[PDB]
Amino acid sequence: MAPYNETYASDYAFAYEGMVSDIAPADIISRTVETSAGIGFGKIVAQGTSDRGCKADVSAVSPTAPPLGITVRSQATENLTLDKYPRYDGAAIMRKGVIWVLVTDAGGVVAGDPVWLKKSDGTFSNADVGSSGGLRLAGCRWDTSAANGALARMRVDFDVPPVAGA
């Protein structure tokens, strides 16, 4: 009977942090979490050192060492970390479907835009940062107009090599 965090919303929300939207194709890949803390749901991941592991640290990704994919919302995750994949757990990375993610940009994004990754934190945006600290995920595009700090769905394809931007 818990009425806390009641906002009396006009209508239903759109999605959650890492939920997918149904479509026939999806590469979902099982990896093992390597970071000491968990990994959030809609997040980018790099290639681990365990030959099948992944890390949440993408500060050193390059066109030669591209990022691995994006985690998905699992909803059965050990109930000790709130919404995360705990250490030593199947990660369920996705690299082909359409997924809801979080926007980090001042002016927001619109339907068809490039997707730029900020290597410092691992956040998605519309344009390059400008100090050799951003990559462009070459095969990727948005699918929703959204403001700053809101959820937008994007279409992703990680087999296309990334592009470095200074």
């Binding site: 009977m1 818990a2 806390y4 009641e6 239903y12 929300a13 939207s21 919302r73």
Partner: protein
């Protein structure tokens, strides 16, 4: 006065039939607070759940495959329970001197112990004790209290009375983003008298309480009736020692009191010509869950 337990009657005297017991105020917490007793007798906490779903609808085409999906989430919350008790005792020759006068001393003590138990439950329900932090209905600190529109209701005309009364219902309605209506109103008894004894005009001879029944916002928008009650402890419960009135919905889903154990007497004990009967009772406090459906108005 005199606890000597016996009296002397005179040859030349007249005696009235029956004894007069001192009066105490009525009990006033049935029907105004939802309580339950289904909790097991020895519990420490109570839990309850909530959940919210999410989704969107999109335009599909033939031979396509992309259809939008829905989602879920959940939450949990808890409350506590505590223990208290009262019981009586008596000596040997006291009860024996009692029985030969046809009195039944043990019964007279059990009756009054039930009475004082009910009194304790009332005080916990409607107020707080500041020992177990059992916030009551009249002083809960998580609901919103607003001041009246300059209304003292003495030397105030009927327009101000009606505006002040409807202010609370409208404010509660706007606070919940226009979804729920206040269902019950609790006023200090003095203000209830002021309303019930003031007329509506020289040509409209009728009380402000007889017209307000069928013309308040709640009974005008919908067809259901509104219930107005005058209470006893609201004379000075406000912010600066001023009258307070409460508007709320009165559903088991907004307020809740748990009483796992009502009141029990334990087997008698004997020590040195005495008889001790311990009575214990264990009940948790009042829980206001939906705090946006209870409204305080001060200054009437």
């Amino acid at each position: 006065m005199q606890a000597n337990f016996g009296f002397v009657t005179s040859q030349t005297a007249y005696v009235e039939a029956g004894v007069y017991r001192m009066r105490y105020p009525e009990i006033r917490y049935p029907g105004l607070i939802p309580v339950d007793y289904s909790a097991p007798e020895w519990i420490k906490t109570v839990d309850y759940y909530s959940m919210d779903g999410v989704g969107k609808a999109e335009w599909i085409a033939d031979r396509a495959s992309d259809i939008p999906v829905v989602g879920l989430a959940m939450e949990k919350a808890t409350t506590t329970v505590h223990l208290a008790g009262i019981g009586y005792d008596y000596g040997l020759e006291e009860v024996n001197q009692a029985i030969m006068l046809g009195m039944n001393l043990p019964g007279e003590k059990a009756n009054l112990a039930r009475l004082v138990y009910e009194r304790m439950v009332d005080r916990v329900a409607f107020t707080g004790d500041a020992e177990k932090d059992f916030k009551g209905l009249f002083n809960n600190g998580a609901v919103t209290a607003v001041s009246a529109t300059t209304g003292n209701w003495a030397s105030a005309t009927a327009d101000q009375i009606l505006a002040d009364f409807n202010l609370g219902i409208t404010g509660l309605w706007s606070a919940t983003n226009e979804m729920v209506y206040a269902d019950t109103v609790l006023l200090p008894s003095a203000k209830h008298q002021i309303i019930a004894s003031k007329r509506l005009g020289n040509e409209a001879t009728e009380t402000v309480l007889q017209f307000l029944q069928r013309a308040n916002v709640y009974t005008a928008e919908t067809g259901r009736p509104l219930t107005i009650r005058g209470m006893r402890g609201l004379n000075t419960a406000g912010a600066g020692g001023v009258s307070r009135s409460v508007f709320y919905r009165n559903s088991p889903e907004v307020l809740k009191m748990h009483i796992p154990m009502r009141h029990r007497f334990l087997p008698v004990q004997v020590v040195g010509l005495t008889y001790k009967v311990p009575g214990i009772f264990r009940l948790g406090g009042l829980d206001i869950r939906l705090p946006k459906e209870v409204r305080y108005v001060d200054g009437y």
